[PDB]
Amino acid sequence: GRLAGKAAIVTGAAGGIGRATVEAYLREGASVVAMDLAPRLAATRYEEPGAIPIACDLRAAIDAAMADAVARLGGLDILVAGGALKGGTGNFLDLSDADWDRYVDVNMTGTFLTCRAGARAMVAAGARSARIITIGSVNSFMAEPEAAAYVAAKGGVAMLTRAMAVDLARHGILVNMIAPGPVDVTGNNTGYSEPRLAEQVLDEVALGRPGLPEEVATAAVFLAEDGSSFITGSTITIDGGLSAMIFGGMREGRR
Amino acid sequence: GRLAGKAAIVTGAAGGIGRATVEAYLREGASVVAMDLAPRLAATRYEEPGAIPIACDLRAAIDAAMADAVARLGGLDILVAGGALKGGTGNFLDLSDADWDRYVDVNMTGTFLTCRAGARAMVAAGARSARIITIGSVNSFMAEPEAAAYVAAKGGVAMLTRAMAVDLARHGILVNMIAPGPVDVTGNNTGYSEPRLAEQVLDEVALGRPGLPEEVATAAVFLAEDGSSFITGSTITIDGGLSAMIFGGMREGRR
Amino acid sequence: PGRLAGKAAIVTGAAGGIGRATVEAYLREGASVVAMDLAPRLAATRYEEPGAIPIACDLRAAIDAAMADAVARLGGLDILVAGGALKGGTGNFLDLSDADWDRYVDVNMTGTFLTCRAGARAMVAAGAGRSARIITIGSVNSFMAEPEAAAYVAAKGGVAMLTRAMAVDLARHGILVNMIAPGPVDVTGNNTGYSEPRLAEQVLDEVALGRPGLPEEVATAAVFLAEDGSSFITGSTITIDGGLSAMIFGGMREGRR
Amino acid sequence: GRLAGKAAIVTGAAGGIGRATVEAYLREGASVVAMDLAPRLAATRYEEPGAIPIACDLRAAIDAAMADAVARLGGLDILVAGGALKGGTGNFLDLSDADWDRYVDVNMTGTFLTCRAGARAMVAAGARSARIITIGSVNSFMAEPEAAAYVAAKGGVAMLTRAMAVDLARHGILVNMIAPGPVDVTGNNTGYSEPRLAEQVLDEVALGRPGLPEEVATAAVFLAEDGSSFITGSTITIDGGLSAMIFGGMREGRR
Ligand SMILES: OC[C@H]1O[C@H](O)[C@@H](O)[C@@H](O)[C@@H]1O
Ligand SMILES: OC[C@H]1O[C@H](O)[C@@H](O)[C@@H](O)[C@@H]1O
Prior knowledge:
The structure is a homotetramer.
Chain A: E1 7-11, H1 16-27, E2 31-36, H2 38-42, E3 52-55, H3 60-73, E4 78-81, H4 97-124, E5 130-135, H5 148-168, E6 173-180, H6 195-204, H7 213-224, E7 235-238
Helix pairs in contact in A: 1-7, 3-4, 4-5
């Protein structure tokens, strides 16, 4: 197994990409803590056995859950910070303080708090480099409409990732971001089925479809394995060509 | 004058780039509110006359100052959001919750609150497009060492800028970021004079020196004037070639 | 006084939309301007502003001759705008011929290289460094690909990186180098660019401002990058695309869906 | 094996990264054609057995070699376009037509001719998606001094890659670039040993060293395997943090 004997924590582990990451990590031989909200963990089944469920809430709760997790693993080699709120609010003109605060607090500050706690535990455990992997978005670089808080926080996560890579290189830790495009988490191909939205996926994604969580999780394996030892401060974009293309609606097969 | 008769608010107006922006705006014919901390405004002189000083503190204070400012101008055509904390903390491993919160609250949330208030006033005043200009940094794209909170917040400002451009285009407002590199604000050539730091500026900046605030303010004029009517969601980088170059220390004249 | 008062400028592709608008803006801001393009195209252009010095050229011996000719007539060289460019699509990459590849790479990339090297050499001979200024015209296609135009797209990437490389090497010689990256620009003069129905719909979806730009909206950046106040700007790109490169899923936005 | 039963062509296969790619591909179960100059192939030994040597010269020679290669494999699933001239010339002012032409012809046009031939053979063979992997550089995005031709051609390769991704998505082919930073190909740690250069590697690369060819080859495996099915038009950067960091010489441990 490519991750044989490594200790990993995956946050947002009841969500689409987080769940798929837990499963891929278990198949590749890692010992894995799956962290998410207690009720969400309660309602998840993993396709692979061995996951250690640990409830958490994206500051005291994060430190508690992380200490708990590291205690149970006896170390920490890989952290995947996948806890995240994804959603739009409306136009910027009408964006409330409460929606701004929730996205910034949960996506940005939550990622900061998890990663600091994890980096500290990796150094305490003797960090072969340890690995921190952040889940950003194509929205870390280009903005969707009517989601300014989510978008801003994703830019914050992208730069937080680069800053961490710079500061933790001396401590034996590599840090990188995965930037997914549209991903269908429903499990029954009903994500992106609204007609206007489906048309726009066909126009804007060169592969003409949303991704599956498993197509994202594979990058999480790649960035955690021993062979990725010169990769840090970088982004792996997994978006079917979305960020590579302009005027995709004009292409042969679409127009 | 290129800005003749336009109403402008400049935040961070007692700081280097903000002060230089107030002056350039006044010379190009604008009516200008200069906003900053009361004690800092108290201790500033502008080289050009006509600035309307309005004290503020980077939420209730921002809304009060902005209403006050728009009342005094009788409209709002241009906002420059330059209020910002610039500084490093230490290594990411040791970054406290308090330093994280201060940079994120002041640089990111402060910019959000100022821009929402300003966009709302521009629409109420009948937004030729109105203009919002944000002051980010090269640190919005690449990380300096030991400044993870500042760096993260600058990434958040960059993406906030793009999200605003997308959402406010329908409301007649263009939104862009200025990304300065090293800028000497001291006024007496003593910024970047520490020997190791001076050597690194020579290596990393193709022009081999820090910029002056006035070399940044000129972009703020350009992005506010009528001719810039197709420019939105973009960044103007003003860094002497810093972000364009790698292994600059190996170039002819340096090695 | 005029923001460019008393500066000598060469504008290539000067009979084309953006080049023509650049000549005009430069003349209005007080520059002495050589307009370079193909002889027959210069023959068929009128400038809205007087004072342009026409010099025929063909985007290697032709370029060196025209550039020496141009510098001779201006008595110096302070600003070069390299706007000569072929813009067009070919078809799918699978079917792209050697001849179309060679034409776009030779004209857009090698032509820009040859013009800029000759210009930089003349700026140094004339005593650059106030810095001399080289401005290249790239495209949003320097960074993101349109369909069925792989040769044009590749060459635009080459121009973007040539620009950065020139900025690094010519900083010591007193020359600043930057790129302008336009999105869709209507050069027709009668609002018929981007009128094809499917294309019009896609401009509404992908450009936040919901329309193509005008050449004059690009030329303004050429003034900005050539003036004395832009003295710390080099190796950078000014993007002028109505929010095209900033936005994804623009067709879903309020007012469009 | 992650590439079990796939047919691959690797160009520049006697060079550092190309050699390491051939070896990784053979270990992961692929049938591999190694293409390079005849004399260079003559003087290479692969650490893994099974490589099919095919001499070529980076237009008629490329078409001949490619047809030859596809004939011997009985198909084509993966192309790695690694043939490339790497070198600096001097200052831009003094760059000759001959050096410009050589870098543009070999790096850019050579990559174009190889990839068109390969894409055509992949479609003829019934392209699970086929995979084209280009080897660019950090110089595809940021310029090193005194190498303008090399740099320009690397920017051309980057955009050629994105254009191919857009056009070939409908034909079942995913296209991505690997962007290495400094890589020691010498085999005896003498790459980057010149004192001034060694000091600049320490400053500019967060990991503080050059990479090894094997640290690049691992990305070529990742981008060729079935699980990477939603990745196209993207770049994997493998540079020890070089492109992520500014003022790296000022970091703790360096200053
Ligand atoms: O289809 C992808 C494409 O969407 C757009 O039109 C652009 O804004 C790009 O940012 C992106 O690459
Ligand atoms: O020139 C300084 C240099 O710092 C680095 O090595 C890179 O990240 C570049 O972006 C930058 O230009």
